[PDB]
Symmetry: C2
Subunit: 224 residues, 2 copies
């Protein structure tokens, strides 16, 4: 699709870039020492201040499919988001929050989604006091090398599942895929109730093996 712009550089962006290999990514940062790592990761480097409108334009934010924002502090991240919104009101903005208390301000500035790595981290650590299964779960289903992965499968128009409940769909027994959620618009229902009825456009959030995932895609396709 369209290129992705990343504003700022942290240790998050390095791991982000690694997963986005094969997509057109522009990294806008003012730290020149980072240029070589950016190129090594397969991305393009654009030197400038992401809180400056003219530099966001240089990165072609107005033609991006999304902008990911993670500057050194939350106030700078907010400043950058405000600059993006002056240029492009509709472009999807994903931002990293440093502090929990600032999340609402990141949204208010214009972020469509906020990710708080240190909230996630602190919560996983406190939950790892006796055993690490919850932390193992989160880190395994996000890793590519895992046999069992977390995927999103959209329910197409004319799907065999349209109008069918979670209970009657019997997705785990039929396909081997665990439904952990169904999402639509900006809403996510985790562990949907048996009487939730699938709609075309619903996104199924599932966990399964690659062959289980294919069985799921076939099961929910339109009749032939």
């Amino acid at each position: 699709s369209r290129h992705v712009v990343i504003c700022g550089w942290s240790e998050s962006t390095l791991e982000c870039l690694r997963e986005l290999r094969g997509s057109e990514v522009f990294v806008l940062a003012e730290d020149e020492n980072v240029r070589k790592k950016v190129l090594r990761s397969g991305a393009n480097f654009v030197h400038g201040d992401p809180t400056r409108v003219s530099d966001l334009e240089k990165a072609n934010v107005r033609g991006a499919r999304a902008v990911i924002v993670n500057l050194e502090s939350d106030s700078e991240t907010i400043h950058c988001i405000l600059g993006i919104r002056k240029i492009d009101e509709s472009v999807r903005i994903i931002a990293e929050a440093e502090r929990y208390e600032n999340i609402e301000q990141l949204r208010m500035a214009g972020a469509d989604q906020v990710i708080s790595p240190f909230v996630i981290s602190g919560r996983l650590m406190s939950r790892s006091i006796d055993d690490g299964y919850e932390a193992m779960f989160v880190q395994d289903v996000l890793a590519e090398e895992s046999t069992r992965r977390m995927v999103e499968v959209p329910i197409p128009e004319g799907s065999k599942l349209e109008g069918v409940s979670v209970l009657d769909a019997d997705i785990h027994d039929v396909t081997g895929v665990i439904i952990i959620g169904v999402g639509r618009g900006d809403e996510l229902i985790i562990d949907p109730p048996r009487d939730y009825s699938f709609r075309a456009g619903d996104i199924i959030l599932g966990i399964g093996k690659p062959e289980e995932i294919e069985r799921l895609k076939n099961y929910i396709s339109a009749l032939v």
Copy 2:
């Protein structure tokens, strides 16, 4: 009949620490750091503050690392985290150590020093971000299933000795239809099986990793309780 839980030690201060402490309200926690500016933050969360160097064995001794329920390590760099872990292992070879890694390449070195579990917030973050380009459902899930205020939570439920499920396969156990809890994994020792096969057979000591409503969770606990009390 409930033996008091042992204290937890936290070494260092990062932005993870504030949220960690918030979740450990109601348990005995000691925080060892050499930054005095954090003392008020520690007391405000209900924990105790110990001023000292976490890479210094005597200060680790002072922070009651010995006999702790767990030690959580999050220093400013991976080399310093490693230095701290080595100090802990000279004091207590068996205590459970959880460490925060700054850079991915250092994870195995942290494990080698003595960490039983490594958590990498920038790896998690980078991956969630990369998955959020079009929509945010995976990031919403991870952050939602970890929050206390959610109607649907991720929990760990142990299979008790003499359980009805002992010897019972996942298929025959029919846990989701019986209790309403999604089984996302089963754990034991340092190992986790995500989404166990139909013919996996439950054992006493197994930990069920599940997602459900509080009442569904209670139904799981009754279903798997011992036949004989």
